Every structure is written in C-alpha cells, then in structure tokens.
Amino acid sequence: GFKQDIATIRGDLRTYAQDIFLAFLNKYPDERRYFKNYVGKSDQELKSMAKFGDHTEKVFNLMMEVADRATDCVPLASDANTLVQMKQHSSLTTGNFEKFFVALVEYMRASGQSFDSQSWDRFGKNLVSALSSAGMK
C-alpha cells in the first residue's frame, strides 16, 4: 500500500526521483521552462549535473516526508503551506502540481511493481486541494 510505497521509493530515492522527474518533463515539455539549466539536455546528460541529482533527491525527500505525515492520503495543512511559501514555487499554480501527479501515477502504473497507484492519485488530489486552500492560484 501507500506506506510500503514510501519505503520502496525511499530505498532507492535518487533513482526513483530522477526517473519520475524525467517522466514529468518528458510528458509535459513546457514545464522544463521553469528549470533553465535543464534546457537542451537528454535524460542521460541530466544524470551527471550535480544540481540535477541533488535537486531531485531533495524534492522527493520532502514529498516523502509530506506523504509519511499524511493520514489516509490527506496531507497536513502545514505541509501544503510550506510548499506554497517556498520562493522556488512563487510562479506556480495548482495545475503544475496536477501535472506532476499525473506523471507520477502514470509512472507507477507502467512500472512492473505493485505501487498503490490509486492512493498516490488520491494523495495528489488531496495535496492540490490543500495547496489551493493555502492560497496557491
């Protein structure tokens, strides 16, 4: 289930974080514009820029912390607030996060593994609702 998925992802956090982030950028290429240093790089090229692996790991670490603190896939309002307030997320709307979760859920469904993809889909929806509540446009 969802708790075990957190453990699976944590076990190989950098690999999952990179793969899922790449699935996101490749599904939604317009989103690459927010990451000016990643423009004009292939999958394998990004996997060699320091900030890429370190970025992705840090993002997914936070995501895992938010997922672990959630109850029944509902995130804490305090965690949504953090996400809205981050200077790095100042130009974002909920639609950016919707895209993120669509990519993540698609990745999990395509995986050979027994991810609880329905719970990640719900988590994402619940997080998007909490982001709006916390004032994200």
CA dist 77 and 28 (Å) reads 27
Taking CB under 6 A as the binding criterion, the range among 2-10, 15-23, 42-50, 58-66 that sits at the site for ligand HEM is 58-66
Residue closer to ligand HEM, measured from CB, 15 or 61: 61
Residues 59 to 78 in contact with ligand HEM, rule: CB under 6 A: 59, 62-63
Residue closer to ligand HEM, measured from CB, 16 or 97: 97
Query: Are 84 and 91 a contacting pair, CB within 8 Å?
Result: no
Alpha helices per DSSP H over 12-93: 13-27, 43-46, 50-69, 77-85
Instruction: Indicate the helix (H) or strand (E) that contains 125.
Output: helix 117-133
Does the footprint of ligand HEM cover residue 88 (CB under 6 A)?
A: yes
Residues 106 to 135 in contact with ligand T6C, rule: CB under 6 A: none
Query: Are 103 and 133 a contacting pair, CB within 8 Å?
Result: no
Which positions touch ligand T6C (CB under 6 A)? 17, 20-21, 24, 56, 59-60, 100, 103-104
